[PDB]
Structure formats: structure tokens, C-alpha cells
Short mmCIF file of C-alpha atoms in Angstrom, two decimals:
data_model
loop_
_atom_site.label_atom_id
_atom_site.label_comp_id
_atom_site.label_asym_id
_atom_site.label_seq_id
_atom_site.Cartn_x
_atom_site.Cartn_y
_atom_site.Cartn_z
CA UNK V 1 0.00 0.00 0.00
CA UNK V 2 1.74 3.22 -1.06
CA UNK V 3 0.55 6.47 -2.59
CA UNK V 4 2.23 9.79 -3.46
CA UNK V 5 0.23 12.75 -4.79
CA UNK V 6 1.39 16.04 -6.31
CA UNK V 7 -0.74 19.07 -5.64
CA UNK V 8 -1.67 22.52 -6.78
CA UNK V 9 -4.01 25.45 -6.13
CA UNK V 10 -7.16 25.41 -8.38
CA UNK V 11 -8.79 28.59 -9.75
CA UNK V 12 -12.45 27.36 -9.86
CA UNK V 13 -12.44 25.42 -6.55
CA UNK V 14 -10.70 27.46 -3.85
CA UNK V 15 -8.76 24.31 -2.85
CA UNK V 16 -5.41 22.48 -3.00
CA UNK V 17 -6.01 19.73 -5.59
CA UNK V 18 -4.09 16.43 -5.17
CA UNK V 19 -3.55 14.22 -8.26
CA UNK V 20 -2.41 10.60 -8.76
CA UNK V 21 -1.84 10.82 -12.56
CA UNK V 22 0.85 13.50 -12.99
CA UNK V 23 4.63 13.86 -12.48
CA UNK V 24 5.87 11.19 -10.00
CA UNK V 25 2.41 10.41 -8.51
CA UNK V 26 1.37 6.73 -8.10
CA UNK V 27 -1.17 4.51 -6.28
CA UNK V 28 -0.54 0.94 -5.08
CA UNK V 29 -2.05 -1.82 -2.90
CA UNK V 30 -5.40 -0.26 -2.19
CA UNK V 31 -4.34 3.24 -1.21
CA UNK V 32 -6.42 5.48 -3.55
CA UNK V 33 -7.32 9.16 -4.11
CA UNK V 34 -11.06 10.00 -3.96
CA UNK V 35 -12.03 13.74 -3.79
CA UNK V 36 -8.71 15.17 -2.60
CA UNK V 37 -8.79 12.50 0.16
CA UNK V 38 -6.68 9.32 0.65
CA UNK V 39 -8.82 6.27 1.49
CA UNK V 40 -7.26 3.76 3.93
CA UNK V 41 -7.88 -0.14 2.39
CA UNK V 42 -7.32 -1.75 5.81
CA UNK V 43 -6.72 -1.25 9.56
CA UNK V 44 -3.03 -0.91 10.40
CA UNK V 45 -0.09 1.46 10.85
CA UNK V 46 0.65 3.87 7.99
CA UNK V 47 3.27 6.52 7.51
CA UNK V 48 1.68 9.81 6.45
CA UNK V 49 3.60 12.83 5.11
CA UNK V 50 2.90 16.11 3.31
CA UNK V 51 4.75 19.13 1.91
CA UNK V 52 3.38 22.47 0.74
CA UNK V 53 5.67 25.08 -0.91
CA UNK V 54 4.71 28.78 -0.92
CA UNK V 55 5.83 31.98 -2.67
CA UNK V 56 4.29 34.69 -0.42
CA UNK V 57 3.62 38.18 -1.86
CA UNK V 58 3.94 39.37 1.75
CA UNK V 59 3.53 43.22 2.04
CA UNK V 60 2.26 45.55 4.86
CA UNK V 61 -1.51 45.35 4.25
CA UNK V 62 -1.08 41.58 4.34
CA UNK V 63 1.21 41.48 7.41
CA UNK V 64 -0.31 43.96 9.90
CA UNK V 65 -3.04 41.29 9.90
CA UNK V 66 -1.21 38.30 11.50
CA UNK V 67 -1.19 35.20 9.19
CA UNK V 68 0.79 31.99 9.96
CA UNK V 69 1.65 29.15 7.59
CA UNK V 70 -0.29 26.07 8.77
CA UNK V 71 -0.22 22.62 7.08
CA UNK V 72 -2.26 19.77 8.63
CA UNK V 73 -3.57 16.28 7.70
CA UNK V 74 -7.17 15.59 8.78
CA UNK V 75 -8.60 12.20 9.25
CA UNK V 76 -12.21 11.69 7.61
CA UNK V 77 -14.78 9.05 8.90
CA UNK V 78 -18.36 7.93 8.24
CA UNK V 79 -18.20 7.14 11.98
CA UNK V 80 -17.78 10.90 12.77
CA UNK V 81 -19.44 13.96 11.22
CA UNK V 82 -16.67 16.53 11.84
CA UNK V 83 -12.89 16.28 11.46
CA UNK V 84 -9.91 15.42 13.65
CA UNK V 85 -6.05 17.06 13.18
CA UNK V 86 -3.99 13.90 12.73
CA UNK V 87 -0.99 16.28 12.84
CA UNK V 88 -0.08 19.83 11.75
CA UNK V 89 2.98 22.07 11.36
CA UNK V 90 2.70 25.85 11.88
CA UNK V 91 5.18 28.66 11.03
CA UNK V 92 5.27 32.49 11.23
CA UNK V 93 5.51 33.97 7.69
CA UNK V 94 7.06 37.21 6.28
CA UNK V 95 10.04 37.31 8.68
CA UNK V 96 11.36 40.69 7.39
CA UNK V 97 10.67 44.42 7.05
CA UNK V 98 7.07 45.27 5.02
CA UNK V 99 7.51 48.38 2.76
CA UNK V 100 10.67 46.72 1.42
CA UNK V 101 8.62 43.87 -0.11
CA UNK V 102 9.95 41.14 -2.24
CA UNK V 103 8.74 37.60 -2.56
CA UNK V 104 9.24 35.31 0.50
CA UNK V 105 9.47 31.50 -0.09
CA UNK V 106 8.94 28.77 2.55
CA UNK V 107 8.14 25.03 2.63
CA UNK V 108 6.39 22.99 5.39
CA UNK V 109 7.04 19.22 5.66
CA UNK V 110 5.64 16.78 8.27
CA UNK V 111 5.39 12.94 8.41
CA UNK V 112 4.45 10.44 11.16
CA UNK V 113 3.20 6.86 11.62
CA UNK V 114 -0.45 6.40 12.76
CA UNK V 115 -2.98 3.68 13.73
CA UNK V 116 -5.57 4.13 11.04
CA UNK V 117 -8.79 2.17 10.34
CA UNK V 118 -10.10 0.62 7.09
CA UNK V 119 -12.36 3.30 5.62
CA UNK V 120 -10.56 6.30 7.16
CA UNK V 121 -10.19 9.23 4.73
CA UNK V 122 -7.18 11.58 4.92
CA UNK V 123 -7.16 15.12 3.50
CA UNK V 124 -5.01 18.19 3.99
CA UNK V 125 -5.79 21.55 5.58
CA UNK V 126 -3.52 24.51 4.71
CA UNK V 127 -4.14 28.21 5.78
CA UNK V 128 -6.93 29.26 3.34
CA UNK V 129 -5.47 32.77 2.87
CA UNK V 130 -2.23 31.29 1.46
CA UNK V 131 -3.80 28.65 -0.82
CA UNK V 132 -3.36 31.16 -4.27
CA UNK V 133 0.29 30.97 -3.17
CA UNK V 134 1.07 27.19 -3.47
CA UNK V 135 3.66 26.10 -6.13
CA UNK V 136 3.67 22.93 -8.36
CA UNK V 137 6.61 23.02 -10.93
CA UNK V 138 8.20 19.68 -9.79
CA UNK V 139 6.96 17.98 -6.57
CA UNK V 140 7.15 21.15 -4.57
CA UNK V 141 3.78 20.25 -2.98
CA UNK V 142 2.79 16.64 -2.19
CA UNK V 143 0.79 14.21 -0.06
CA UNK V 144 1.60 10.53 0.49
CA UNK V 145 0.85 7.51 2.67
CA UNK V 146 2.39 4.03 2.88
CA UNK V 147 1.49 0.93 4.88
CA UNK V 148 4.08 0.05 7.49
CA UNK D 1 7.07 -2.81 15.29
CA UNK D 2 6.42 0.92 15.55
CA UNK D 3 6.23 3.58 18.23
CA UNK D 4 4.77 7.12 18.15
CA UNK D 5 5.30 9.43 21.16
CA UNK D 6 3.90 12.93 21.82
CA UNK D 7 5.95 15.33 23.87
CA UNK D 8 5.42 18.41 25.98
CA UNK D 9 7.56 20.56 28.23
CA UNK D 10 7.49 19.32 31.84
CA UNK D 11 7.66 22.40 34.15
CA UNK D 12 8.55 20.12 37.09
CA UNK D 13 11.33 17.96 35.56
CA UNK D 14 12.17 20.72 33.02
CA UNK D 15 12.46 18.22 30.14
CA UNK D 16 10.70 17.43 26.83
CA UNK D 17 8.54 14.64 28.28
CA UNK D 18 7.70 12.02 25.63
CA UNK D 19 4.64 9.95 26.59
CA UNK D 20 3.09 6.89 24.97
CA UNK D 21 -0.29 7.34 26.70
CA UNK D 22 -1.72 10.61 25.28
CA UNK D 23 -3.07 11.87 21.92
CA UNK D 24 -2.13 9.44 19.10
CA UNK D 25 0.74 7.80 21.02
CA UNK D 26 1.17 4.02 20.68
CA UNK D 27 3.81 1.29 21.24
CA UNK D 28 3.83 -1.97 19.29
CA UNK D 29 6.02 -5.04 18.46
CA UNK D 30 8.67 -4.55 21.13
CA UNK D 31 9.52 -0.83 20.76
CA UNK D 32 8.91 0.91 24.12
CA UNK D 33 9.48 4.17 26.00
CA UNK D 34 11.65 3.89 29.16
CA UNK D 35 12.68 7.13 30.94
CA UNK D 36 12.41 9.45 27.87
CA UNK D 37 14.24 7.02 25.55
CA UNK D 38 12.95 4.59 22.92
CA UNK D 39 14.49 1.16 23.56
CA UNK D 40 15.38 -0.84 20.41
CA UNK D 41 13.83 -4.78 20.75
CA UNK D 42 16.16 -6.22 18.06
CA UNK D 43 19.04 -5.58 15.63
CA UNK D 44 17.83 -4.19 12.31
CA UNK D 45 17.00 -1.14 10.24
CA UNK D 46 14.66 1.48 11.68
CA UNK D 47 13.18 4.72 10.39
CA UNK D 48 13.52 7.42 13.09
CA UNK D 49 11.63 10.76 13.07
CA UNK D 50 10.86 13.72 15.38
CA UNK D 51 9.02 17.06 15.19
CA UNK D 52 9.38 19.89 17.72
CA UNK D 53 6.95 22.85 17.66
CA UNK D 54 7.93 26.14 19.34
CA UNK D 55 6.15 29.47 20.02
CA UNK D 56 9.00 31.87 20.90
CA UNK D 57 8.51 35.09 22.93
CA UNK D 58 11.67 36.47 21.19
CA UNK D 59 11.99 39.77 23.14
CA UNK D 60 15.16 42.00 22.74
CA UNK D 61 16.74 40.92 26.04
CA UNK D 62 16.36 37.16 25.26
CA UNK D 63 17.74 38.02 21.79
CA UNK D 64 21.09 39.64 20.84
CA UNK D 65 22.86 36.73 22.59
CA UNK D 66 22.28 34.43 19.52
CA UNK D 67 20.17 31.38 20.56
CA UNK D 68 19.39 28.76 17.89
CA UNK D 69 16.61 26.22 17.38
CA UNK D 70 18.40 22.84 17.56
CA UNK D 71 16.73 19.39 17.68
CA UNK D 72 18.66 16.10 17.61
CA UNK D 73 18.17 12.34 18.13
CA UNK D 74 21.03 10.77 20.14
CA UNK D 75 21.83 7.05 20.10
CA UNK D 76 23.02 5.15 23.18
CA UNK D 77 24.32 1.64 22.53
CA UNK D 78 25.97 -1.14 24.55
CA UNK D 79 28.45 -1.21 21.63
CA UNK D 80 30.13 2.08 22.61
CA UNK D 81 30.92 4.77 25.21
CA UNK D 82 28.26 7.44 25.66
CA UNK D 83 26.04 8.85 22.91
CA UNK D 84 26.46 9.70 19.18
CA UNK D 85 23.83 12.31 17.06
CA UNK D 86 21.88 10.04 14.69
CA UNK D 87 20.97 13.37 12.99
CA UNK D 88 20.10 16.97 13.99
CA UNK D 89 18.54 20.11 12.53
CA UNK D 90 19.29 23.75 13.42
CA UNK D 91 17.55 27.04 12.71
CA UNK D 92 18.12 30.75 13.46
CA UNK D 93 15.14 31.92 15.61
CA UNK D 94 13.61 35.43 16.00
CA UNK D 95 14.23 36.92 12.57
CA UNK D 96 11.34 39.43 12.98
CA UNK D 97 11.99 43.00 14.27
CA UNK D 98 13.46 43.12 18.27
CA UNK D 99 11.26 45.89 19.81
CA UNK D 100 8.24 44.87 17.71
CA UNK D 101 5.99 42.26 19.39
CA UNK D 102 4.29 38.92 18.35
CA UNK D 103 5.01 35.31 19.32
CA UNK D 104 7.29 33.61 16.72
CA UNK D 105 6.22 30.08 15.58
CA UNK D 106 8.60 27.54 14.12
CA UNK D 107 8.47 23.74 13.79
CA UNK D 108 11.48 21.40 13.15
CA UNK D 109 11.01 17.94 11.51
CA UNK D 110 13.71 15.23 10.85
CA UNK D 111 13.34 11.56 9.67
CA UNK D 112 15.84 8.93 8.48
CA UNK D 113 16.65 5.19 8.40
CA UNK D 114 19.50 3.92 10.62
CA UNK D 115 21.03 0.54 11.47
CA UNK D 116 20.49 -0.11 15.23
CA UNK D 117 21.28 -2.88 17.74
CA UNK D 118 19.19 -4.68 20.35
CA UNK D 119 19.21 -2.70 23.60
CA UNK D 120 19.92 0.58 21.84
CA UNK D 121 18.35 3.72 23.35
CA UNK D 122 17.13 6.79 21.42
CA UNK D 123 16.64 10.19 23.05
CA UNK D 124 16.16 13.75 21.90
CA UNK D 125 18.38 16.79 22.44
CA UNK D 126 16.61 20.14 22.02
CA UNK D 127 17.92 23.70 22.79
CA UNK D 128 17.46 23.85 26.60
CA UNK D 129 16.68 27.56 26.67
CA UNK D 130 13.69 26.98 24.31
CA UNK D 131 12.31 23.88 26.11
CA UNK D 132 9.45 26.22 28.30
CA UNK D 133 8.19 27.07 24.76
CA UNK D 134 7.57 23.54 23.33
CA UNK D 135 3.92 23.32 22.05
CA UNK D 136 2.29 19.87 22.64
CA UNK D 137 -1.23 20.62 21.37
CA UNK D 138 -2.41 17.40 19.62
CA UNK D 139 0.97 16.04 18.46
CA UNK D 140 2.69 19.16 17.22
CA UNK D 141 5.75 17.71 18.99
CA UNK D 142 6.38 13.99 18.49
CA UNK D 143 9.01 11.22 18.42
CA UNK D 144 8.63 7.93 16.57
CA UNK D 145 10.50 4.84 15.37
CA UNK D 146 9.43 1.94 13.14
CA UNK D 147 11.30 -1.08 11.88
CA UNK D 148 11.84 -1.44 8.16
CA UNK M 1 17.47 -2.75 1.22
CA UNK M 2 18.27 0.66 2.76
CA UNK M 3 21.09 3.20 2.60
CA UNK M 4 21.93 6.33 4.63
CA UNK M 5 24.65 8.76 3.47
CA UNK M 6 26.22 11.74 5.24
CA UNK M 7 27.29 14.79 3.24
CA UNK M 8 29.83 17.57 3.33
CA UNK M 9 31.27 20.40 1.23
CA UNK M 10 34.37 19.25 -0.62
CA UNK M 11 36.84 22.20 -0.58
CA UNK M 12 39.14 20.97 -3.38
CA UNK M 13 36.15 20.31 -5.66
CA UNK M 14 33.25 22.70 -5.18
CA UNK M 15 30.67 19.92 -4.60
CA UNK M 16 28.34 18.44 -1.93
CA UNK M 17 29.90 14.98 -1.40
CA UNK M 18 27.91 11.97 -0.14
CA UNK M 19 29.80 9.43 2.01
CA UNK M 20 28.66 5.91 2.89
CA UNK M 21 31.39 5.31 5.52
CA UNK M 22 31.17 8.16 8.06
CA UNK M 23 29.04 8.55 11.23
CA UNK M 24 25.73 6.60 11.10
CA UNK M 25 26.00 5.79 7.36
CA UNK M 26 25.25 2.28 6.06
CA UNK M 27 24.41 0.28 2.90
CA UNK M 28 22.13 -2.78 2.83
CA UNK M 29 20.32 -4.98 0.25
CA UNK M 30 21.72 -3.60 -3.01
CA UNK M 31 21.28 0.14 -2.48
CA UNK M 32 24.74 1.60 -3.23
CA UNK M 33 26.54 4.92 -3.75
CA UNK M 34 28.28 5.34 -7.16
CA UNK M 35 29.60 8.94 -7.64
CA UNK M 36 27.20 11.25 -5.86
CA UNK M 37 24.25 9.07 -6.89
CA UNK M 38 22.23 6.31 -5.13
CA UNK M 39 21.82 3.33 -7.53
CA UNK M 40 18.43 1.54 -7.36
CA UNK M 41 18.94 -2.66 -7.21
CA UNK M 42 15.37 -3.58 -8.30
CA UNK M 43 12.04 -2.10 -9.46
CA UNK M 44 9.78 -1.15 -6.58
CA UNK M 45 8.59 1.55 -4.21
CA UNK M 46 11.29 3.32 -2.24
CA UNK M 47 11.12 6.05 0.38
CA UNK M 48 13.58 8.86 -0.52
CA UNK M 49 14.77 11.56 1.89
CA UNK M 50 17.48 14.28 2.10
CA UNK M 51 18.39 17.07 4.54
CA UNK M 52 20.92 19.88 4.02
CA UNK M 53 22.13 22.22 6.82
CA UNK M 54 23.68 25.67 6.25
CA UNK M 55 25.24 28.44 8.37
CA UNK M 56 25.68 31.55 6.18
CA UNK M 57 27.75 34.72 6.88
CA UNK M 58 24.86 36.50 5.06
CA UNK M 59 26.16 40.04 4.10
CA UNK M 60 24.29 42.66 2.01
CA UNK M 61 25.45 41.81 -1.53
CA UNK M 62 23.93 38.27 -1.31
CA UNK M 63 20.75 39.65 0.37
CA UNK M 64 19.85 42.15 -2.38
CA UNK M 65 20.69 39.36 -4.84
CA UNK M 66 17.65 37.71 -3.16
CA UNK M 67 19.29 34.27 -3.36
CA UNK M 68 17.24 31.43 -1.86
CA UNK M 69 18.02 27.99 -0.38
CA UNK M 70 17.00 25.19 -2.79
CA UNK M 71 17.34 21.42 -2.17
CA UNK M 72 16.10 18.80 -4.67
CA UNK M 73 16.61 15.09 -5.44
CA UNK M 74 16.95 14.31 -9.13
CA UNK M 75 16.23 10.99 -10.83
CA UNK M 76 18.20 9.70 -13.79
CA UNK M 77 16.32 7.04 -15.76
CA UNK M 78 16.84 5.47 -19.22
CA UNK M 79 13.02 5.23 -19.18
CA UNK M 80 12.93 9.04 -19.25
CA UNK M 81 14.68 11.96 -20.92
CA UNK M 82 17.29 13.63 -18.73
CA UNK M 83 17.15 14.22 -14.99
CA UNK M 84 13.71 14.80 -13.43
CA UNK M 85 12.97 16.54 -9.62
CA UNK M 86 11.54 13.74 -7.52
CA UNK M 87 10.79 16.67 -5.17
CA UNK M 88 12.34 20.01 -4.18
CA UNK M 89 12.22 22.57 -1.37
CA UNK M 90 13.10 26.30 -1.57
CA UNK M 91 13.58 28.73 1.32
CA UNK M 92 14.23 32.49 1.63
CA UNK M 93 17.69 32.99 3.23
CA UNK M 94 19.09 35.80 5.46
CA UNK M 95 15.77 37.28 6.70
CA UNK M 96 17.44 39.74 9.19
CA UNK M 97 18.88 43.30 8.84
CA UNK M 98 22.72 43.12 6.95
CA UNK M 99 25.13 45.68 8.60
CA UNK M 100 24.85 43.93 12.15
CA UNK M 101 25.94 40.33 11.45
CA UNK M 102 25.59 36.96 13.38
CA UNK M 103 25.63 33.88 11.06
CA UNK M 104 22.21 32.70 9.69
CA UNK M 105 21.41 28.98 10.16
CA UNK M 106 18.77 26.94 8.30
CA UNK M 107 17.91 23.38 7.20
CA UNK M 108 15.74 21.82 4.48
CA UNK M 109 14.39 18.26 4.87
CA UNK M 110 12.47 16.26 2.15
CA UNK M 111 11.10 12.66 2.19
CA UNK M 112 8.58 10.79 0.01
CA UNK M 113 7.72 7.40 -1.50
CA UNK M 114 8.24 6.91 -5.27
CA UNK M 115 8.08 4.04 -7.77
CA UNK M 116 11.58 3.56 -9.20
CA UNK M 117 13.17 1.15 -11.70
CA UNK M 118 16.28 -1.08 -11.63
CA UNK M 119 19.31 1.02 -12.71
CA UNK M 120 17.76 4.34 -11.66
CA UNK M 121 20.13 6.90 -10.11
CA UNK M 122 19.31 9.50 -7.46
CA UNK M 123 21.36 12.62 -6.83
CA UNK M 124 20.93 15.91 -5.04
CA UNK M 125 20.80 19.47 -6.38
CA UNK M 126 21.61 22.25 -3.94
CA UNK M 127 21.98 26.01 -4.65
CA UNK M 128 25.62 26.03 -5.91
CA UNK M 129 26.39 29.36 -4.23
CA UNK M 130 25.51 27.92 -0.80
CA UNK M 131 27.53 24.69 -1.22
CA UNK M 132 30.80 26.47 0.89
CA UNK M 133 28.34 26.73 3.83
CA UNK M 134 26.86 23.17 4.16
CA UNK M 135 27.51 21.77 7.69
CA UNK M 136 29.27 18.40 7.53
CA UNK M 137 29.25 17.61 11.27
CA UNK M 138 26.85 15.27 13.14
CA UNK M 139 23.99 14.23 10.93
CA UNK M 140 23.04 17.68 9.72
CA UNK M 141 23.37 16.86 5.98
CA UNK M 142 22.29 13.45 4.64
CA UNK M 143 20.68 11.49 1.81
CA UNK M 144 18.93 8.11 2.08
CA UNK M 145 16.65 5.58 0.39
CA UNK M 146 14.87 2.44 1.65
CA UNK M 147 12.65 -0.09 -0.04
CA UNK M 148 9.01 -0.19 1.06
#
């Protein structure tokens, strides 16, 4: 069971879109992509990881308002209506002086092993205000899971 | 054979206290937590990972004297003397303006495969001055090992 | 089948050199180092990871140049054209004010699962300007692959 997705920001849907048919993406052993969510085949331990790369416009009107870079993986269940934070990484953005603006680049990576159930659905959750700022080029942004 | 620990700052012992009994923590197949160290069950190859999440005050007075974000995994073995760094990561903290306020957030994540021996002990080594500021809200700070 | 390499800045040659015989480095099951490339034994899914650590003087010249930290893993395959980015991570460097110094420290870590073929070769690609400042001590800079 292994799966690696590449992702990008979409114009129509205001979301980060994962794909299993582009670049170095692949699906194997039951792990599969269904509506920007990874479906777990069986109960067991899986390693889950994600990266999101950003080019931030920054600038004073956007940084007097405080906005952090947050990248999380959310489980999904039919056994629960809401969502639960499997894990998340959070960083302060625009670590420099405002008027002098210039593009600021940063990447968040996290990975961990979890005790997941058959039928669990995993999706990502990145700061909505920074979504128009995600890169794709070559595996700059990805999502993947493998059975341990 | 896999272990996932969550950690928080312990105001009493003044240590990053890894636990296997909170959040998404689990121990399986022989890997276990004994006095802040992961004990290795058998000889073999293991993937080791750790994330530390910090919210730094930063100040002006806690600054100037250059303090760095450093997180490492140390290996203790019956095959040698004291401890050796399996790996470590380091970052410059507080890169925002001195007198200006706001809490600074930064996460550090490391993960690699290593050849280990039965009875081996893994522990973490994080910048002591920044320990009070570790953030253990739902596994933002974790330590885990799994056998390959 | 796993391999972990440590890396350092050659001074004689201006390159990031991977070593399979220093610190916690090891080779197992057919994964081997030939030049600065990891040779893949058989077809299959492999987890790939790499971390690079830098301490930069910083200055003003190379601040207004707006140079950024970039770390990528490239794949060489007969099944493809030239080299292709399995993944990459970019980061804004020196985010402090220039005239006052201290050295600026940062790290970039990447890891993901990929389907690779027998005879495939993996190498790294780091910002060539920053190569003089890669840390070679402990396990700050490394490259590794393991079969899933």
C-alpha cells in the first residue's frame, strides 16, 4: 500500500487539488485518491507525510493582519461527522521588514506513523489565505501515505 | 514494530517529556518508552523521526545573545561509550523586528533510516533555553520509530 | 534494502559529497553509492529523503541578490529523458537586517515514497552558491533511500 500525490491550487475550486496521474504520482495496494482525500484499504499502521511550498507576496496590508503558515492532515470518517487534526505544522511567515517587499518562499514538511482504520479518509488543511500561493513546478507540494 | 510518542515541556522535571499514553501515542512489536528514551527490541533497520513545535517570545533581552533552534536524536548503545547524534537540525530563531511584538512560531522535523542494535536507546536533544516554549497541542511535537 | 549517506562540502572540488562510511551511514540490500548518486537494485517503491544544513555569513550583496536555499533530489532514468525533480524545497535565506551580522542557520528536509526502476540513479541538487556553507558535522546533511 503506497501512494504519493502532487498538488496545486485550483482557480475554480478554492482548494489544493491532489492528483495521482501526474509527475511522480502513483497509487498501489489499495491506497487510492477519492475527492482530494486518501482512502485507507485496511486497519493498520501507515506513515503519512505532506509538503506544501509557498511563494508569499507578503507586504504591509497583508502582514499587519497576523497570518501563519499552517499545514495539517485531517482524518475523515463515516463514523464521525466533523474532522480530527492527525498532525499539523505551523510557522510564522514574512520574517522581514514590510515596505521593502519582495517575494518570501517557505516550505512545510511533516510525516508520522499512525494507527488508522479501514475506511478512514485523509485530507489536507492549509491556511486558506495562502492557498493562491502554493507552487507545483516539480513535486514542490505533495501528499503521500504508505502501509508500514 | 512501531512507536509514536507525543511530547510536551514538563515544568517540574524541566524536560521534553515524551509519553506513549496521550493523543495518538502508541507502542507496538517490542519498541517501548523507558525514561524518555525509545528502547530498540532487536538488531535491524529502523526509520527514526521527530518534530518539535515552538512558540517563541523572542523579546530583545532574550535576543542579541544568539540562541538557535536545535533538535537532535542521540543514540546510546551497549556497543560504545556514551552517545552519538543520529541526525540533527538547526535554525536561526527570532528573525522578525526586536522591539516589535508577536510570538514567533517555528516547527522542526527530521526523519531517516539507521542501522540499530538490540538494547539501543534513542533520546532527543533540544535547545534547553527553548524547552518552556515547546507546544504539545495534539501532536505538534512527536518522536517515533518503526522497523523497516 | 536501505542506505543512509552523510554529506559535506568538498573544498578541493566545489561539490556536496555523499559518504557511505562516516558517522551513522550504512548500505544494505543492493542500495549503493556510485559517484554522488544512489543506484536503485530492483524495481519497486522506495522512500527517498534528504536534509541539508547551512550556516551563512549572510552580508548585504547576497541579500539584495535575493538568493534562496533550494534542495532537490533528481532521478536519472533510461526510461525518461534527462534528470527529473523527484521533489524540491526552496527557502528564503538571510531574513534579518545586513550591517549587524551573526551567522544565519537553516535546514531543508524532504522525504517521500516513489516508484523507481532497476538502474535508476538518485542525486541531489543544492543552490551552488551555498555549497561552501553546508555543515558536515553530526547528521546535519544526509541522503537516504529504503525499499518499502
